[PDB]
Design a protein around this ligand. Structure first.
Ligand code: FY9
Ligand code: ZN
Length: 295
C-alpha cells in the first residue's frame, strides 16, 4: 500500500515571525496514525492544540491563521506546503508564539529540516481526497477551482500591472516539489510594506525572508531563485492551503488571482459538496496515480 508517514526524529528550529518580529522556537514531533498535522502553542499553560483543518481557519487576510478561542497560529501555509510536498500525514508542530517562523520566506528550510530528520512509514494506508466533480468558487475576477485529475497538479495565474512582470503549471508526475516549488520565496511591494510597518506589522520583514519589489524591480541584490518565483510562491501557498483538507489530493487545482481567503472558500464548498469528493486508499502503490520519494 501507499503507507501513512510521520517524522523519524524530532526537528527543532528557531526563526522570526514575519509580522511580530518575535523569535519563535519550533519543534516537529512524530505523531500516531490518523493524527494529521496538529499545531500546539507550548508557550501557554495549558498548551493549546489546533488541528491544521479547514474548519479551524480564522483569518485569511494576509496568510492562513488557525484559531481556537482567543488563541491563534499565524502563517501555517509554508510549513503545511512542506508537509504536503513530502507526504507527511501525522506530526505535532509545537510553537513558542502565535506565528510560524518565516525562515527564508520559502518552504526550502522546512523540507531540508524534515528530510534531515527523515520520514517513518506507519502501518496504515494513506488516505487521499479524490476530486470527482468540478468545484469552482469566484469572487469578482478571482477564481479557485478543483477539477478531477488522476494525479496531483496545480496551475496558477496572477495579474500585476507591473514592470518586473505570470502563470505556471506544475504536475507532480514530472515536477519535483522540492527542486521546482519549495524554494520560491514570499514577495511584497515597498508601498504595502511601509504601510504594514506604519501599522506596527511585517516587523520581522527583511531581504533575508522576502523578495522586496519596487514599482519597477526586485530590490534584493542577490535576485530571484526562479524567473517565475512569484507565481511559484503562489503555487507553494495554494498547496499549503489545500493541505488543510487534512489529506493529500487526487485532482487538479486552478487559481486565478486566488489567495488564502478564496482558497479557504474553495475548501469549505468542496467539504460541503460530498458528491464532489471521496476518501480513497491504494493497497497497491504500483497502480496509484501518485508517488512520493523513498522515506
Ligand atoms: C499577498 S500574497 O503574496 O498572496 C500572500 C503570501 O503568499 C503569504 N503566504 C505570505 O507568504 N505572506 C503574507 C503577506 C506578507 C507580506 C510582506 C510583509 C513584509 C515584507 C517585507 C519586508 C521587508 C523586507 C526588507 C526590509 C528592509 O529593511 C524591510 C521590510 C514582505 C512581504 C508576506 C508573507
Ligand atoms: Zn506564502
Amino acid at each position: 500500500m501507499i503507507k501513512q508517514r510521520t517524522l523519524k526524529n524530532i526537528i527543532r528550529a528557531t526563526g522570526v515571525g514575519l509580522h511580530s518580529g518575535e523569535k519563535v522556537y519550533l519543534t516537529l514531533k512524530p505523531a500516531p496514525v490518523d493524527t494529521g498535522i496538529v499545531f500546539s502553542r507550548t508557550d501557554l499553560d495549558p498548551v493549546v492544540e489546533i488541528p491544521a483543518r479547514a474548519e479551524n481557519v480564522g483569518e485569511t487576510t494576509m496568510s492562513t491563521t488557525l484559531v481556537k478561542g482567543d488563541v491563534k497560529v499565524d502563517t501555517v501555509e509554508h510549513l503545511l506546503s512542506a508537509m504536503a510536498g513530502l507526504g507527511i500525514d501525522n506530526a505535532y508542530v509545537e510553537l513558542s508564539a502565535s506565528e510560524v517562523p518565516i525562515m527564508d520566506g520559502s518552504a526550502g528550510p522546512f523540507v531540508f529540516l524534515i528530510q534531515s530528520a527523515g520520514l517513518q512509514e506507519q502501518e496504515a494506508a494513506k488516505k487521499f481526497i479524490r476530486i470527482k466533480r468540478e468545484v469552482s468558487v469566484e469572487e469578482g475576477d478571482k477564481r479557485a477551482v478543483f477539477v478531477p485529475f488522476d494525479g496531483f497538479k496545480v496551475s496558477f495565474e496572477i495579474d500585476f500591472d507591473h514592470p518586473v512582470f505570470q502563470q505556471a503549471s506544475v504536475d507532480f508526475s514530472s515536477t519535483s516539489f522540492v527542486k521546482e516549488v519549495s524554494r520560491a520565496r514570499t514577495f511584497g511591494f515597498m508601498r504595502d510594506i511601509e504601510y504594514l510597518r506604519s501599522q506596527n506589522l511585517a516587523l520581522g520583514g527583511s531581504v533575508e525572508n522576502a523578495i522586496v519589489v519596487d514599482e519597477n524591480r526586485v530590490l534584493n541584490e542577490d535576485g530571484l531563485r526562479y524567473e517565475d518565483e512569484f507565481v511559484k510562491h503562489k503555487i507553494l501557498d495554494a498547496i499549503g492551503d489545500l493541505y488543510l483538507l487534512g489529506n493529500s489530493l487526487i485532482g487538479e487545482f486552478r487559481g486565478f488571482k486566488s489567495g488564502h481567503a478564496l482558497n479557504n472558500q474553495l475548501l469549505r464548498t468542496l467539504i460541503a459538496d460530498k458528491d464532489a469528493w471521496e476518501v480513497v486508499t491504494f493497497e497497491d502503490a504500483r497502480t496509484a496515480p501518485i508517488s512520493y520519494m523513498r522515506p
